[PDB]
Amino acid sequence: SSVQTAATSWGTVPSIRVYTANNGKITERCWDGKGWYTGAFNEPGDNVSVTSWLVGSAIHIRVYASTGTTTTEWCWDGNGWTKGAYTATN
Amino acid sequence: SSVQTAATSWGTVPSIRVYTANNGKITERCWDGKGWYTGAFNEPGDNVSVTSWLVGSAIHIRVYASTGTTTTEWCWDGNGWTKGAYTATN
Amino acid sequence: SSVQTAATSWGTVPSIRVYTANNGKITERCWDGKGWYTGAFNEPGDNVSVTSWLVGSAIHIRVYASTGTTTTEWCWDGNGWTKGAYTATN
Ligand SMILES: [Zn+2]
Ligand SMILES: [Zn+2]
């Protein structure tokens, strides 16, 4: 019984984001080239996946947090985490 | 018990694919910039991971579906899912 | 019930790396355009995630291996796997 992680990165420094699902909560650790620090993302979930992409210099991150059969998409687009349009129907 | 997902994205719109393993079946949800829809991928698996890459305008997707100690690679290269040559000795 | 995998890819060939967590061991399978082979990475873990990036033609890989609440980061930067600076407080 171990925590479950997901990772993404962008750029050439690079920036790295590691999401950890632990006891029903997902938290975020961040690297921007200097050191690791705790990120703003903190949402419920037993399982996590992530993907990201750049548009110019702007990073866009999508975190897929799952509890039971419900997957919630969380969006970072430069100004805070927001709930995305993703639905599944599991 | 929660479902397990894997996500990938390409391009700048972007396109996103989210794979969900649920009770031994993997299904696929797709975003191409307008809304989410159900993808063609549907294969057995209790665990899924994914990676993708572009060569010019051509997208390639590799989905690794596992049941027990067996991992099957599924390939998208523009015209249907096929599977791949991947083998493991788990 | 099943093994757990993580995948990454880079370049246009492409190179693919698939990490498998199985009974407390994470192992690595590699594709560089010709066939699959077993990689050098072999470390303890019940869960694995991965990310990678290019700096020019040089590939960098980060593998996040977790046991219990401890996540260890493993780094490939061209010349062997080394433990990274990642820490979490799970
Ligand atoms: Zn359960
Ligand atoms: Zn191709």
- Furthest-apart CA atoms within chain B: distance in Å: 41
C-alpha closest to that of C83 among C69, C73, C47: C73
> Domain-by-domain residue ranges, chain A?
1-84
CA atoms within 13 A on the CB side of B49: 25
CATH architecture of C1-84: Beta Barrel (2.40)
| Ion ligand 1 contact residues with beta carbon within 5 A | B 1
Give resolution, Å, one decimal. 1.6
> What residue of C is the nearest CA neighbor of A16?
C51
- Furthest-apart CA atoms within chain A: distance in Å: 41
Task: Encode chain C in three state secondary structure.
Answer: CCCEEEEEEECCCCEEEEEEEECCEEEEEEECCCCEEEEEEEEECCEEEEEEEEECCEEEEEEEEEECCEEEEEEECCCCEEECCCCCCC
Residue B55 token pair: 């060569």
Measured CA to CA, the distance from residue C25 to residue C23 in angstroms comes to: 6
Task: For residue C77, report the phi and psi dihedrals to the nearest 5 degrees.
Answer: -135, 30
> What residue of B is the nearest CA neighbor of A58?
B12
Separation in Å, CA of C89 to nearest CA in chain B: 23
Residues in chain B: 90
- B86: helix, strand or coil: coil
Residue B85 token pair: 């040559």
Sheet holding C25-31, edge to edge: C4-10, C15-22, C25-31, C36-44
Beta bridge partners of A76: A61, A81
* Residue-wise burial string across B3-41, b where 16 or more C-beta atoms lie within 10 A, e elsewhere: bbbbbbbbeeebbbbbbbbbeeebbbbebeeeebeebeb
User: Is C17 exposed, middle or buried, given 0-12, 13-18 or 19+ CB atoms closer than 10 A?
Assistant: buried
- For residues A53 and A62, is the Cβ–Cβ distance under 8 A? no
Chain B residues within 8 Å of chain C (Cβ atoms): 45-53, 55, 60, 62, 64, 66-69, 71, 85-88, 90
Q: Which residue has the tokens 């390639």?
A: B60
